[PDB]
Amino acid sequence: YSKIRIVGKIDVLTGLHIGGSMIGAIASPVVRDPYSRLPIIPGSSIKGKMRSLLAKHIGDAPEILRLFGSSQKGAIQSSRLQISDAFFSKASQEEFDKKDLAYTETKFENTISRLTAVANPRQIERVTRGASFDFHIIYNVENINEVMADFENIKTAIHLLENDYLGGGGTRGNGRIRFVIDSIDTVVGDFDSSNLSIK
Amino acid sequence: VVKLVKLTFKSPVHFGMKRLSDSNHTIAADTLFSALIIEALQQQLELSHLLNNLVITDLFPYNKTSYFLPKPLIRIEGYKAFKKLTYIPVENYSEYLRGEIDSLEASKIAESLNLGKASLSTKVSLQAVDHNGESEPYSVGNFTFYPESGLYFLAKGNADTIGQLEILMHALQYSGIGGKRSAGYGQFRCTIEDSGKFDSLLSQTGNIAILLSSAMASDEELVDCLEDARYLLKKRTGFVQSKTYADQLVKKKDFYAFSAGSTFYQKFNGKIFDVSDNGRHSVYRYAKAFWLEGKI
Amino acid sequence: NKKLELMYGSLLHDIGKIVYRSTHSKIGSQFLNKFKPFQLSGIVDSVSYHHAYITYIADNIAYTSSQYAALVNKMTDDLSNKLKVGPDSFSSLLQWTESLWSYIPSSTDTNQVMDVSLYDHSKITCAIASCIYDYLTEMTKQFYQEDVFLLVSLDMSGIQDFIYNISGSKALKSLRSRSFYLETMLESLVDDLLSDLELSRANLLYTGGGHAYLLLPNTERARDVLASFEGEMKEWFIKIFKTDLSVAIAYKACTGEDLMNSNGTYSDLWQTVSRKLSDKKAHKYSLNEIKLFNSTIHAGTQECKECLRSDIDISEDSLCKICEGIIAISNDLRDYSFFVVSPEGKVPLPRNRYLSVENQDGAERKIKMNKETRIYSKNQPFVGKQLVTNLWMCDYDFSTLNPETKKQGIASYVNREVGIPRLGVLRADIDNLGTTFIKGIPEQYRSISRTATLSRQLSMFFKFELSNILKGARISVIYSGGDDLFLIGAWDDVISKALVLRKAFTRFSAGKLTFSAGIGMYPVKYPISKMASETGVLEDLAKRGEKNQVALWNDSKVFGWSQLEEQILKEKMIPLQEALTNSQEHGKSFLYKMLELLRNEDQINIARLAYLLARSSLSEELTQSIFAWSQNKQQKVELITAIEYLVYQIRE
């Protein structure tokens, strides 16, 4: 058995509202670390977006189920991609502590109704552009024969995700991200993953 | 040889006890042992050492200052403060056994636990919007440990078993522990080292024995170990997590085991209970006993 | 029927005082002789000698004239018409005594405090007489020194977990019927124990939330009955709820002097009983039961969503029999009045019986179908009905006042023409009530009648009086349970009725009791389980402080009752409202600007506020008061809360 660790950064190109109170306050606060209060990216959001993109490109498919797990009758497969939560990076913490920059921002938005032409204010918290999240992925090499293919699939997903959005109102210009794959280092087993690249 | 294994958690953990919306801050010894069995099966190792000779405790909190232990269930000579109290630091353990801890000290100990903060993250499922219908929102309860805190446990066994446990824990660092370990939770880093304070504490003979792991004895040991002893029967259940058990996920046979901290005047060596029912492989449940002796 | 006559005499031994207020023993004698059924030897002998032997020893161990005359006339009418002598008719008599003599003092025109009511003293005397008679059937100062009594306390384990084993699919119904079914099951346990011991409800000292205290004779037959009842109920609770619910029952044998607070052993006796109960709750199981637990055979394919159990047969819609019965009886418990413990019904109950809520016609039909069918009347002081015991319940729902509103449920509370459409949830309880029971009364004034009076008054206020308290407000009491209160309704009405509840609770018990509450705001579509959990954490934070607090909304708004009623909603909210409605130029945007200024922690904002107040066209007095409030920290958060409340009330 082998497990391949993919570390890197998730550079935010447009304010990411990964979602997840009082009047006149942020109606939809992003998720935060409970103690540090730093905004984070739930690994479930990454896993869901990548699974959706890979499924749309591929098209229940065996590749999607073998990568992202399946509980279906008969075909019980352990998910190979364990995508941990992406936490705020220390470097972005320092870059935002300088220039007294808030870690997040509160975009004010509205919605002109098609009937009365009235607007509805909406204070969406978004992680401010230029914020980097230290994402973390583990790949489970259940079978040595289909590693490369799955990595190709992963690359496709990541490519799609860099042209699509992450969680939030992405079609309205939220959460565009760029993966900076710092390394792909095998942590469990003797499998060699130097020739595999996510991007 | 007893090895202290401290886990520092990089990401919030689920650690469910009966559902998904809750988040216990620890797991029993049976959960950790099942995780070790799953790991030893994935790593193609041999399960003989985990089954025949390995005694582990529950996961217990530990702060920057003190290592915590379960509060022993002993008679008290106010009462609500002691009832709310759950964990006692190692330094204040022998004092608690002798009853020198008053209600104010017990309350201060209960407030001194800085293990972490429990939160509830609401998630969604979009697997129905693509075909037809709506999104299904659910919620996962997580528990984020404070930066200097962690969850520790103790392992006892042969040198070979200790090495195999080190390998399995190294794999578990990235496999994850607790529920939702594939959706971002449960990632941790483990450190295995010789324990000095714990070695002195466990090499202590007392009039009573305290369980440090969720355990239960067979018929022959239970007929003698139930003499005027205080305990807490916890209901250990759950579905089976495997690929080679059944076409659809199948629940285990319900189990009931003494909770950690239960006090027994007679020490019993537990056994691993097979809770499988109509499956291709026996689903083990760890119920061996890790005893710490004390005076009251 | 010597025992029945003795208990009739013991309960009605001090009626002579009542007829005198309109030796009292003789007056009670002829007054009992005025009615043909009440002419048996035991009653008259007890009334005469209480000033038989047993009644005298039990009594030893235990305004305007127009009102007294009217009560005497009513008592005469009830005795002649509705009350008869005979087995199973005693419960009606005891209900009558509880309903009438509660306001009449037991002892009057005495320098000692008249804090013991006639009902309390008569009931205690009847209980002591029953115990003494039972011991003598088993076979003066030496009699007091003799051990003649058992104090029995039975407590329910895991009530809170059982209430909140709800999956959230039908959380409201589950919570309500689970609480009702738990308290009813406790009452059924008490009644079964009393019927086993051949004792009336007078021997049951009192029941709180999942806790019951009652005194019994020291007879070996009583001890064997207690052991058999403990074993049978433990087995039944294991069968129907494996470790989900339990009852632990412990007893301590005491002498006569212990009850009358002689030698100061009353508190020590109760502490010993509590310690024995704690030990029995710690052990809680036996070898055979553990082996039965660990000898499961089949895993079970499917499980109930709420109950989360597989061995019990599961319905098609994923609900076990017990859970399904709870959900089904949830609506009946509020729709009808009578509770029937019959051979067949809707929810399980010990001794192979079933609880079902029916009307009076259903109760009488189930009585006629088979005897040994218990009936409980809910919130009705009439005592003419037979085989009925009054079980208090706070079943107040504003939705049931209309059929369509009943169909809608709590979703009708958020139907508001004005104001923000949200739902308020209130979780309350009393601070240090156990301390009030143990050490609240001074050692000089300790007595069993005293504690019984306090517990009866507390239960009455929590269940019967709470319905009167919330009348006129859109509140659905999810459960008054024991001392804690879970309530859900409109946010405005929830908060207003919480304040009114605090004021009424201060008026009651002479303001020596305090209760902490938490109020939470959630949308209508919000899951009930999350509402309950979050309001519970709010109340936990409120009680974390010192004595009474109200953790309104966000944890940063931990207030006090006087502070919330006056410093927030009175001195600040009302001026803001009157300024808003009176002014023709300013509206909600001005309030939002003030709120934005106040929320900001930077000092310069205060100055900015001043500038706004300069061109606000507001009254000068209100301007200066707002400035003063914004300067001070506590008054700043008070004004923030007042502004938020006004904005919520003025939304839409």
Ligand SMILES: Nc1ncnc2c1ncn2[C@@H]1O[C@H](COP(=O)(O)NP(=O)(O)OP(=O)(O)O)[C@@H](O)[C@H]1O
């Ligand atoms: N039927 C009920 N429904 C809801 N709340 C109740 C009910 N009865 C009592 N309560 C109150 O709700 C709480 C739940 O009772 P619990 O039984 O959960 N507490 P406790 O008796 O101390 O547990 P054990 O040490 O016996 O195992 C009580 O403590 C009361 O505050």
Ligand SMILES: Nc1ncnc2c1ncn2[C@@H]1O[C@H](COP(=O)(O)NP(=O)(O)OP(=O)(O)O)[C@@H](O)[C@H]1O
């Ligand atoms: N309706 C009731 N009337 C009288 N006693 C009750 C009632 N319901 C419950 N009880 C009892 O009243 C006690 C209330 O206990 P609590 O759970 O409220 N804790 P308490 O001692 O009051 O201190 P705090 O932490 O709340 O400040 C219960 O433990 C029961 O013993």
Ligand SMILES: [Mg+2]
């Ligand atoms: Mg309380």
Ligand SMILES: [Mg+2]
């Ligand atoms: Mg309470």
